[PDB]
Amino acid sequence: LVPKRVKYRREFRGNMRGRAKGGTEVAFGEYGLQAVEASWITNRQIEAARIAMTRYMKRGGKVWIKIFPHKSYTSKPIGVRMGKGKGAPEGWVSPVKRGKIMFEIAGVPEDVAREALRLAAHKLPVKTKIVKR
Amino acid sequence: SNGRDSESKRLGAKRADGQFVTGGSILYRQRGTKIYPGTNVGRGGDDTLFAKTDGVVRFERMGRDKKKVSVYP
Amino acid sequence: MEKKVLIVGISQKQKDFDYSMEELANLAAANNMEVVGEIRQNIDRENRATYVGKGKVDEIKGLAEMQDARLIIFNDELSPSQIRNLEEALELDVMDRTGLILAIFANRAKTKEAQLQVQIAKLQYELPRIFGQGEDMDQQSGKGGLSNRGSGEKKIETDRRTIKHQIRHLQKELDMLVDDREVRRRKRKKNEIPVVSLVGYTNAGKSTTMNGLVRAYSETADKQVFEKDMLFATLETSVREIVLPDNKQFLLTDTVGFVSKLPHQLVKAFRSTLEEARDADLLIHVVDYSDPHYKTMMKTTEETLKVVGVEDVPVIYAYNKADLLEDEMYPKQTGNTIIFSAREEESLEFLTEVIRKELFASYEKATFLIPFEAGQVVAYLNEHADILETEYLENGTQIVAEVSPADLQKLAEY
RNA sequence: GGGUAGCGGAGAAAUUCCAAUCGAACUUGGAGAUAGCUGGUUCUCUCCGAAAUAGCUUUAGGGCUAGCCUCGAGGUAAAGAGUCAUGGAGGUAGAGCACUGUUUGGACUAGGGGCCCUUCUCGGGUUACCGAAUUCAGAUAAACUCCGAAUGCCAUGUACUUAUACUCGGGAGUCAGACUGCGAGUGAUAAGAUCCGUAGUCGAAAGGGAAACAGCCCAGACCACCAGUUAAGGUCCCCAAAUAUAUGUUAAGUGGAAAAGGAUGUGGGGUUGCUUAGACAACCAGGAUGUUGGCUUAGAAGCAGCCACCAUUGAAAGAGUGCGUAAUAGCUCACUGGUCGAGUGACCCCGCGCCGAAAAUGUACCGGGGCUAAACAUAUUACCGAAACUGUGGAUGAACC
RNA sequence: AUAGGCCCAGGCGACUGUUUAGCAAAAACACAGGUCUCUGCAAAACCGUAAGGUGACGUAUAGGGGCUGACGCCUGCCCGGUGCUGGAAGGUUAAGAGGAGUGCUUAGCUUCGGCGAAGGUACGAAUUGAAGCCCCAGUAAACGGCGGCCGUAACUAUAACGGUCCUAAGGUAGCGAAAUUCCUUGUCGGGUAAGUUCCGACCCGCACGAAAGGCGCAACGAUCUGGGCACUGUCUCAACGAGAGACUCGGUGAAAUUAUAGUACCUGUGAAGAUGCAGGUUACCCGCGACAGGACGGAAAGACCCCGUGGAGCUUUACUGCAAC
RNA sequence: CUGGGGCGGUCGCCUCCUAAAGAGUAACGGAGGCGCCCAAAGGUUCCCUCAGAAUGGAUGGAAAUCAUUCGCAGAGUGUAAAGGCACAAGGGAGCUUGACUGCGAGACUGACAAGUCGAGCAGGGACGAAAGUCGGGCUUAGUGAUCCGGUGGUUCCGCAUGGAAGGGCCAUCGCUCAACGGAUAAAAGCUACCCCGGGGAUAACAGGCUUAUCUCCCCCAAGAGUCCACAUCGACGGGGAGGUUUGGCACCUCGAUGUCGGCUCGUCGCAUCCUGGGGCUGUAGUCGGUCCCAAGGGUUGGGCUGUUCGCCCAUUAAAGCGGCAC
RNA sequence: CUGGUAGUUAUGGCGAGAAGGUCACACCCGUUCCCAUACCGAACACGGUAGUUAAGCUUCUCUGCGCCAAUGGUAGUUGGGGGCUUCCCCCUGCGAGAGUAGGUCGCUGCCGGG
Numbered sequence A: 001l002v003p004k005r006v007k008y009r010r011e012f013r014g015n016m017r018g019r020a021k022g023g024t025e026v027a028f029g030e031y032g033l034q035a036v037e038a039s040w041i042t043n044r045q046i047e048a049a050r051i052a053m054t055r056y057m058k059r060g061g062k063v064w065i066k067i068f069p070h071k072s073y074t075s076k077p078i079g080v081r082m083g084k085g086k087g088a089p090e091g092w093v094s095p096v097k098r099g100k101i102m103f104e105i106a107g108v109p110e111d112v113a114r115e116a117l118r119l120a121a122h123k124l125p126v127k128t129k130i131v132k133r
Numbered sequence B: 001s002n003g004r005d006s007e008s009k010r011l012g013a014k015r016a017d018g019q020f021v022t023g024g025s026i027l028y029r030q031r032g033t034k035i036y037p038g039t040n041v042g043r044g045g046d047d048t049l050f051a052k053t054d055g056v057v058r059f060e061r062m063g064r065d066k067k068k069v070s071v072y073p
Numbered sequence C: 001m002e003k004k005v006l007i008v009g010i011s012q013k014q015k016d017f018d019y020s021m022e023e024l025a026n027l028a029a030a031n032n033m034e035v036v037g038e039i040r041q042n043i044d045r046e047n048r049a050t051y052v053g054k055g056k057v058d059e060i061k062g063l064a065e066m067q068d069a070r071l072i073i074f075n076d077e078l079s080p081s082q083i084r085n086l087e088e089a090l091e092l093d094v095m096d097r098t099g100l101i102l103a104i105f106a107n108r109a110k111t112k113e114a115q116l117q118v119q120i121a122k123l124q125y126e127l128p129r130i131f132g133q134g135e136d137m138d139q140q141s142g143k144g145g146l147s148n149r150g151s152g153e154k155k156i157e158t159d160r161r162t163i164k165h166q167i168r169h170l171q172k173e174l175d176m177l178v179d180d181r182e183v184r185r186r187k188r189k190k191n192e193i194p195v196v197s198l199v200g201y202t203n204a205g206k207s208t209t210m211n212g213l214v215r216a217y218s219e220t221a222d223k224q225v226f227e228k229d230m231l232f233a234t235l236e237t238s239v240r241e242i243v244l245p246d247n248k249q250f251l252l253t254d255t256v257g258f259v260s261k262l263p264h265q266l267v268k269a270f271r272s273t274l275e276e277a278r279d280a281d282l283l284i285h286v287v288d289y290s291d292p293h294y295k296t297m298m299k300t301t302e303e304t305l306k307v308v309g310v311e312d313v314p315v316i317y318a319y320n321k322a323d324l325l326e327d328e329m330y331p332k333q334t335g336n337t338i339i340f341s342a343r344e345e346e347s348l349e350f351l352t353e354v355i356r357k358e359l360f361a362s363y364e365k366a367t368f369l370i371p372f373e374a375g376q377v378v379a380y381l382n383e384h385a386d387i388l389e390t391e392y393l394e395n396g397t398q399i400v401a402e403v404s405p406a407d408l409q410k411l412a413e414y
Numbered sequence D: 001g002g003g004u005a006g007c008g009g010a011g012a013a014a015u016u017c018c019a020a021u022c023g024a025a026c027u028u029g030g031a032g033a034u035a036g037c038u039g040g041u042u043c044u045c046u047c048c049g050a051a052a053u054a055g056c057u058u059u060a061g062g063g064c065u066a067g068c069c070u071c072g073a074g075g076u077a078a079a080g081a082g083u084c085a086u087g088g089a090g091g092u093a094g095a096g097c098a099c100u101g102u103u104u105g106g107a108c109u110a111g112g113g114g115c116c117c118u119u120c121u122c123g124g125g126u127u128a129c130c131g132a133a134u135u136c137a138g139a140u141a142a143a144c145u146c147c148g149a150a151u152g153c154c155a156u157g158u159a160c161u162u163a164u165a166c167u168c169g170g171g172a173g174u175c176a177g178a179c180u181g182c183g184a185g186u187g188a189u190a191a192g193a194u195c196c197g198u199a200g201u202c203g204a205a206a207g208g209g210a211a212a213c214a215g216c217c218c219a220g221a222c223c224a225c226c227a228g229u230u231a232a233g234g235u236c237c238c239c240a241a242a243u244a245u246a247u248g249u250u251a252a253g254u255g256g257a258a259a260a261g262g263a264u265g266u267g268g269g270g271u272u273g274c275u276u277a278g279a280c281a282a283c284c285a286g287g288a289u290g291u292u293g294g295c296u297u298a299g300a301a302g303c304a305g306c307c308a309c310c311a312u313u314g315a316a317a318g319a320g321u322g323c324g325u326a327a328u329a330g331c332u333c334a335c336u337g338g339u340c341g342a343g344u345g346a347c348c349c350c351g352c353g354c355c356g357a358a359a360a361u362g363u364a365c366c367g368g369g370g371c372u373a374a375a376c377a378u379a380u381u382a383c384c385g386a387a388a389c390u391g392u393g394g395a396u397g398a399a400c401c
Numbered sequence E: 001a002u003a004g005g006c007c008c009a010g011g012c013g014a015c016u017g018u019u020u021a022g023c024a025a026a027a028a029c030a031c032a033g034g035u036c037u038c039u040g041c042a043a044a045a046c047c048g049u050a051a052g053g054u055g056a057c058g059u060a061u062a063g064g065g066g067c068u069g070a071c072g073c074c075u076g077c078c079c080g081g082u083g084c085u086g087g088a089a090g091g092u093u094a095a096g097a098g099g100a101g102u103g104c105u106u107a108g109c110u111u112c113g114g115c116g117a118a119g120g121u122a123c124g125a126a127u128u129g130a131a132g133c134c135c136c137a138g139u140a141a142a143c144g145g146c147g148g149c150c151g152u153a154a155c156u157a158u159a160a161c162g163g164u165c166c167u168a169a170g171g172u173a174g175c176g177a178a179a180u181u182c183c184u185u186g187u188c189g190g191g192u193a194a195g196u197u198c199c200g201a202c203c204c205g206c207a208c209g210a211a212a213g214g215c216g217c218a219a220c221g222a223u224c225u226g227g228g229c230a231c232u233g234u235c236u237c238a239a240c241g242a243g244a245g246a247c248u249c250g251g252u253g254a255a256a257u258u259a260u261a262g263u264a265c266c267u268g269u270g271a272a273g274a275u276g277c278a279g280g281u282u283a284c285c286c287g288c289g290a291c292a293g294g295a296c297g298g299a300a301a302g303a304c305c306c307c308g309u310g311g312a313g314c315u316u317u318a319c320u321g322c323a324a325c
Numbered sequence F: 001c002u003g004g005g006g007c008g009g010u011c012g013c014c015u016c017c018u019a020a021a022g023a024g025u026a027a028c029g030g031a032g033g034c035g036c037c038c039a040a041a042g043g044u045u046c047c048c049u050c051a052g053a054a055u056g057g058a059u060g061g062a063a064a065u066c067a068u069u070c071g072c073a074g075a076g077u078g079u080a081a082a083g084g085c086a087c088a089a090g091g092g093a094g095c096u097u098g099a100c101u102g103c104g105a106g107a108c109u110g111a112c113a114a115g116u117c118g119a120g121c122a123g124g125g126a127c128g129a130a131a132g133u134c135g136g137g138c139u140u141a142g143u144g145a146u147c148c149g150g151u152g153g154u155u156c157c158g159c160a161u162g163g164a165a166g167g168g169c170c171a172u173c174g175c176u177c178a179a180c181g182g183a184u185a186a187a188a189g190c191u192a193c194c195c196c197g198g199g200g201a202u203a204a205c206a207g208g209c210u211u212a213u214c215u216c217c218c219c220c221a222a223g224a225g226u227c228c229a230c231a232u233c234g235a236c237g238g239g240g241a242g243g244u245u246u247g248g249c250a251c252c253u254c255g256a257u258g259u260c261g262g263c264u265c266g267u268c269g270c271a272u273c274c275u276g277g278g279g280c281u282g283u284a285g286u287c288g289g290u291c292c293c294a295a296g297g298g299u300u301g302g303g304c305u306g307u308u309c310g311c312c313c314a315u316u317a318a319a320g321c322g323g324c325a326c
Numbered sequence G: 001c002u003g004g005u006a007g008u009u010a011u012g013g014c015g016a017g018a019a020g021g022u023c024a025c026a027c028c029c030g031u032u033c034c035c036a037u038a039c040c041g042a043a044c045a046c047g048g049u050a051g052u053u054a055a056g057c058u059u060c061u062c063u064g065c066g067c068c069a070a071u072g073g074u075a076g077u078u079g080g081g082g083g084c085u086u087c088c089c090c091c092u093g094c095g096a097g098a099g100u101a102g103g104u105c106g107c108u109g110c111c112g113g114g
C-alpha cells in the first residue's frame, strides 16, 4: 500500500490526540479489529496483518483494510550529523487514533473471524479489541 | 534547496471597530478585497482601505459572504 | 512499470558468449528490469580501467540516452576502480552480474538461513566497493595527519569495523544455524535411509520431478514444493519420503538451482545447502533438453558441483521437458542418460524404476516360516519388504520376499 | 694568523650553520608598537535594578541603533494596569468533505485489452485483465475548507478596582543563556539534542521539601527574640509531629524501575444453564444386538484411510472418547437407573496483584533501619513543618498629611 | 690480557667520501662519467650604486649554468601548446616630433541680435614615431605530452597483422603484485609442523617506462629485506654470587610542589568520573621500609583542532609594485 | 554562515506552509518564483460572459468551426503563490496618453537607511451627455546607496573688476558593487619548518545523555524438520533488556584528562567455554542437541599478520563472552 | 389591483404545477427617419398595436433541491489539579462541527396609474 502520487514528498509526523474522527463502527464486514490505543501503522505491518488474516480464511469471505498509509516518513542514515535539510522518505504510515476499526471481515463463521483477527492483531504495534456490528 | 521567504507585510486591521480615526487613517491592509470600502472609506492602489474623513470605524456585513468597513462621523 | 536497464558484454575468448548475454537478459527480466539495449564488444582481454574499451564507454553513454536507461548491467564482475571509472564516464548507475544475482536472491529469499547467506554475499561483494571510497573519504579533509593523542587510523576500521566485523557476526550466526542442520539430519543418518538428491540448472524442472514423485509415491501426498517458470524459484533444500508400491523406501531431496558465472561469494553459502547432495546415495542431474544450450548448461553445472564438493557420487543425467519436442519419444534410457517429461506419470514410473536399480541392489529373495502366534512378523514383511507370494500351512505362515541384508539378520530364525 | 655579516653571509643541500638563539642572529632605538583576545582593577552602607533579543555589519565570543535598567526634568480627561459590559478584525483546535489532493468497497455503462471469433479483429458474444467517467456507501490533509471554537488581540464605556503611563535630557550594562511545563519544527513523536512560540524558575534568590540535587514543589532573607500560625512535604526509629479514626483492597516487600504477550492469583459486580420429583464430584451395576456396517487392503473386526453414521431390545449405550493389537483379544470413556445429600457449571465487566525481569568494586531500582502496614483506595481530623505571615523591640527608603 | 662470527638470497645506491652541532647517516648530497646550453675575451656568469673585483694572471681541449650520475646495453614517437632561438615587415602601441582646427578672451565692427582681426591662453586632428605582442620557421638529455573503433589473428604475442576515425603524436626498447598493485593475504609452486613477509613461474602497470633516465651489473655498505649455521639467561623460568646505591649510625644538606586540611571505603549525587556532598560500611594514636591505583598527581597559559578582519616563511598565469634587462 | 572545520550548499527580493484564528516569530525546516514584461497588456466610455459536457451535423479524426440545451466559475486574470475578481479586477470595440506638473491633512511599516497607502488643493488635460473616473497594469517581486565621472537645462556662485575656468541646483545616464547596507579604483595559494593570542564558546581520546544501529532475550506462528509449527529452527510482522558496536549530541577537561597493540598484575558481571546438578529430545545404546540451576575453580604453546581481529600448526576437560579511562 | 424604484445574510433562491391580461407590462408587426450588427432590425434604436397570454411578468399552491435552524449531548478549550506522559484523566467556565426537532415558496418602504 503506497499513495500513487503525493502533492508533497515530505510531511510533518503530526500527532495522535483524541478518538478517531471517523471509522469507529464496523460498516462493511460482520467483525472488526478496533485500535484501543493510538499508534503509527506502517504499510509493512498492514501487509503482514492482511496476509495473516487472509491465509487463515483460505480465499473465503472478505477483508476490508479501513486504514491507508497516506503519510510518508523520512530517516537520516547512520553517520550523518543533524542538519543539511530533511532526510529522504523511508516508508508510509497510517496514524491510527484510538477507536479506529483498522480491518473488517465478513463471510466466515464467528470462530474463524475471531481467530483470523487475533492472528492479524499479533502483527500490529497497537492494543486491539475484536468488535462486531 | 529551500531556505527562502519574503519579509512579512504586516497585513490585517490597523484600527478597531468603534475607534475614532482621522481622515487618511489606514483601516485594513490586504491583498485584494478581503474587506470592501464602505461609506467615507476608499481603496488604495494596493487594496489598502483608508478613512476619507474623520469619524468612527464600523466593520459591517454587506451580503452573506462579503464584509465592508465604514467611517461614520 | 518495470524500469529501463542496458546490458554490456565482453567475449574474453568465452566458449558460448552468445548464451551468457541471453542469460544475463533473462536474469534482468527476473529482477524486474526492461532490457532496452545490448552492447557487445569483441576484445581478447578486458580493459582493467573501464571493463570495456574507453571508446565503447562513449558508445554506451550515447545509446543509454537514446533509449533512456537509468542504469547499465555488466556481464562480468567489475573491479572497484573498474566501477568508479564507469560511474564518472557514463554519469549513470552501474550493476555487474554478481550484484544483479545478489538482488534476485535477496528478493526470492524467505528463510532466515537463506537471508543470512545472501546478506553475507552482498556485504562481501560491496565491502571492496566501499573500501576504496572509505579510504578516499576524508584523505583531503582530515585531521592534519593526526599529530595528536586521539590515536588509531581513519584509514583502516572505517570500513573494517563498519563492514567485515558484521560479516564476522553474520558468519558466526550462519554457522550456528547450519550446526542445527546436523540435529535435523540426525534421525535419517542414524536410520541409514538412502538419499536421492536432484540438482541442475534453474527452470530444469527438478522441483517439478519432486512434486511428481510425491503425488505418486508419498503416504502424505498433500505436500508439494513450489514450482513456477522463474529463475531461482527454489532457494532452500526440501526432503520428502518416497515409498515405492513394493515398499522400498528412499528420501528425495530438491536443492537450489545453478546458473553460469555464479559469484564466488554465493558459492561459499551454496556449500551449506548442497550438504545433502554431497552426502547423497544417488545424484539425479536434471537438464532442460528442449532448450538449445543444454550441453552448455550441463557442463556449467558439473563445474559448479566440483567447487561445492560433490565428488565420486553415482550420477544419472536425466534430460527433461521431452514433450516440448515432437521428434524424441517420452521415456528412454542410454546408461546415465534418461529422456522423460516431468509433467507425465509414465516418465516418473520409469524414473522410479531407474532409482530402484541403483539403490536396492543388495535386496535379494529369501524364504521365511512364521508361526501364527507371532503375526507381528507377517506385518513387518508386508510393510518393510516386497512379497512375491504368500503361502499358508497348518503349522504357520510361509512367505518368500525381496528383503535387505538388515532384515536377513532380524528374521534369520525364520 | 686571517676573509665573508643579517634586505647579508656560508652550505658534498639538512631549512644546514653564522657564540647553548636561526623559515631569517644579537643589541639598542622607533616603543608604553598593536592585541575586537586572556588575566587583573584595591573602602563602606542606602535606594533602584537588567540582558543574554531584533535589525545591519569581512559580521557571528566585536560593534552600532532599537528593546530591557537607572538618574533628572516636564507636562499630563491619567493618558498606564486588572475585571465587567458592548463592539470588532482574525480561520487555529475541533470538525467536515462543498473545493483541491490522497484513498477503500460495492453498483453502473463507456471503451480499450484478455478470450473465442462467419471478420479486413470493420463489427459481435463473453468478460471480473485493465479502465476513465458516474453515482452509492466509507476514509484522509502542515502547504483542503461548506464550517468553526476556547483563548489571545484591537477598541469603547457615563462601570468597579488599581497605579502607573508618556515626552525630553544625563549614565549604563546586555547581544554565550539554562532547565521545566505547554504548542510546533528538525531528529527516530531519541538526547541533559537543536530551533522557535508561550508561561515559570535559575541566571541575579538565601529559606523549607524532593537523601544528596542552579533550572522541580512550597516560598521571597532589613536586624534581633530560648514567642506564635501556616505552605509544600510529613507524623514507627534515625528525625519535629498520629504506631490517628472509619470502611475496604493487596501477600507481590507489590508498594520501592520495565512492554508485547501469558496465566486454575485474589476481591467485587452483572448476565445466565442444571439442581432435594436429587444436580456436579466420586463410588455400585450396565455400557449390549444386527455386526468383523460397507468399500479399501495381506490385515483393518467402533478406533490406519475413504463413505455412510441407520435401527434395535428400553435404563440406554457413538456404526464409537481415548489408550491397546499385526489383526484379534483386552482395559476406558460418552450415555443412563442406583447409592450419597447441597450446591454446581459456563460467559462478560471492574479493583489490586503474578510471570515476562540478565551486567560488570559492594547490599545498591524505599536515603537507611525497618514495615504486612509504617502499603494502597475512599472519607475524616489533629499535630509537625519555612528566613512565608503574625507578635514584640529596633534600623531604614518613598509617598502623602 | 688484547686480536674477524660465518654463510645463502634479494631491494637501493656504482665505488672512498658528505649530511639534519643536540631525536633521521640513509635509498638523501657529492662523485668520476654523460648530455644540453651559454660564453670570441673589458667573455659569459657573479659581487658592488660605482670604482674595483672574482672568472683568470685563464682564452672554446676554456669558463658559467641546467639536468643526469661509475661501467655495460640502450635511450623510441611528438615542435600542436608553453619556453627558447631565428625570420618577416603587415597590424597594433609610448614618449618625442607635427600643429589642421576648436574653445576662451578683445582693438574694433555692432541693423537690434551678434559677428570679431592681432596677440595671449586652454585644448588639439591628420601625418610621423621602437622594441614587445599578433604571424611564420626551428628546437624535446627544453617545459611538456605519448588514443579509439571494426574485422582476420583457429594457435601465439596481455600490448601483433589488416581496415577505418581522431590526434602534435598515440607509451617504442626494456621491465613489471615493484621503495610503484585498487580488486588482493592475486593464482600455482618453493621454503616452515604452521609463511599477509621472503623467493621463483603464470596472470598482471587502463603502459612502470627510457638522462626529474630504462634495464643489467662484479666490487663496496654501522643501508634495508628474507633464510641458515654457530652460539647463548632472549626465553621455558628463574636461581645463586660480587660491587655501587638502597638500610642503620656520625658529618653535611638541596629541589620541583604547596588555598587551608583532624586528608578511609562503597553505592549514589553533582559542571554528567568525589578524601571533602548523601545514605551506609569500616576505622585506637605516631612512625619506618617498600609499591605506584587515585589525588582528572608535577613539569610546559596544548604542538592536534578551531577562532583572531594575529604573524612569519614559501609559491604562482592573485593584486599592486620595485630592481634588472 | 556552518550541529567542529573543510568539501558541498547558501548570501538580495517576492508568495505559501511551518506560525500556536491580530501583528511578529527560528532552523543547512517544507515548497515555489524574481533580477521582467506591455504603446496596450495603460486611461476612459459603452457593450459583453467563461470552462466543460450532452445532442446533431462535409473534408472533420476523441479533439478545429457552427446550432441548440445544461452549466457560480469547474474558465480567465502577461508572469510563482497567496489573497481577490462574473456591479467583474475576466472579454470586445470607439476615442485617447493621467505610464500628467507642482504637492499633500493624515496613516501604515520600520533601529536607522529606506519602504507603503493617501483624501484633498492648484495647473493643464483624456474619456464621458452628465455623474464622474484617470498621478500606469487585480494586488503583492522585476532591484543597488554614497563617492567619482558623462550629457542636458539654469532670473545661483564666479577668489580685484568684466568675462572665463570651475563649482552649485534641477533632470538623466555610466560597476553581477549578486558576499546584493556595497572594506579598495585595483586582490590567489602552501606551511609537516612554523610562531603568538585565545577557546573545552569548538573537533580528535576517555566519560556523560540518547539507543536509531548493535548484542542478547522474547510474542505471533506461515514454514522447515522423512509424518510432524514449537526435539531443533523460524519468514512476514510485533515487544523488550543491555550499554561491549556503528552512530547522534557537544555537557566536564585545550593555564594538557598525553598515546593503539603487547608485557606485568589482576578484579568484577553471567548472557556458562570446561567441570557439577537437572528437564525435554528426532533420549534404544554410544556420541550428541537444547533449555533450567550453577560464577567454586579452571580456561595453551607456536607459525604468519604492527595488527585488536583473523587464518593456520599442535594440543586441551575447556581453549567462554563482556566490564573496569576500549 | 398592477408598473416603476429601493432596503433586507436565499426563511427571499431554484425546480414543479395552476390560474390571470388594454389597467399598465410583455412578446408581437414594420425598417421610412436618428441609430445599429467585427454578418444578421437577433440584439441595440426608432415607428406602429393587427395578433396573444404561449412565454417573461404578477398572484396562488407545493418542501423535490437548496437555504435557515433550536434544545440536548459530544469534540475542543481558558484557568486550576493529577497521572502509568506516542498520551490520558479530574474540577470550574466557555463551547462547536456534524446530526436532529423544526422553519421557509418571503418580509419591509416610497412613487405613479387602478
Ligand SMILES: Nc1nc2c(ncn2[C@@H]2O[C@H](COP(=O)(O)OP(=O)(O)NP(=O)(O)O)[C@@H](O)[C@H]2O)c(=O)[nH]1
Pocket: C200, C201, C202, C203, C204, C205, C206, C207, C208, C209, C226, C227, C228, C229, C230, C231, C232, C233, C234, C235, C255, C256, C257, C258, C320, C321, C322, C323, C324, C340, C341, C342, C343
Ligand atoms: N512442458 C514442460 N514444462 C515443464 C517440465 N518440467 C518443468 N516444467 C515447467 O518448468 C517450470 C520450471 O521448473 P521447476 O521445477 O519449477 O524449476 P527448478 O527445476 O526447481 N529450478 P529452480 O528451483 O532453481 O527455480 C515448472 O514450474 C513447470 O511449469 C516438463 O517436463 N515439461
Ligand SMILES: [K+]
Pocket: A121, A122, A123, A124, A125, A126, A127, A128
Ligand atoms: K498488538
Ligand SMILES: [Mg+2]
Pocket: B005, B006, B007, B008
Ligand atoms: Mg518569516
Ligand SMILES: [Mg+2]
Pocket: B045
Ligand atoms: Mg500600482
Ligand SMILES: [Mg+2]
Pocket: C206, C207, C208, C226, C227, C233, C234
Ligand atoms: Mg524449484
Ligand SMILES: [Mg+2]
Pocket: none
Ligand atoms: Mg624540508
Ligand SMILES: [Mg+2]
Pocket: none
Ligand atoms: Mg647555535
Ligand SMILES: [Mg+2]
Pocket: D030
Ligand atoms: Mg610609534
Ligand SMILES: [Mg+2]
Pocket: none
Ligand atoms: Mg606592550
Ligand SMILES: [Mg+2]
Pocket: none
Ligand atoms: Mg527590588
Ligand SMILES: [Mg+2]
Pocket: none
Ligand atoms: Mg485537525
Ligand SMILES: [Mg+2]
Pocket: none
Ligand atoms: Mg488545517
Ligand SMILES: [Mg+2]
Pocket: none
Ligand atoms: Mg539544551
Ligand SMILES: [Mg+2]
Pocket: none
Ligand atoms: Mg519553552
Ligand SMILES: [Mg+2]
Pocket: none
Ligand atoms: Mg552571567
Ligand SMILES: [Mg+2]
Pocket: D205
Ligand atoms: Mg533557592
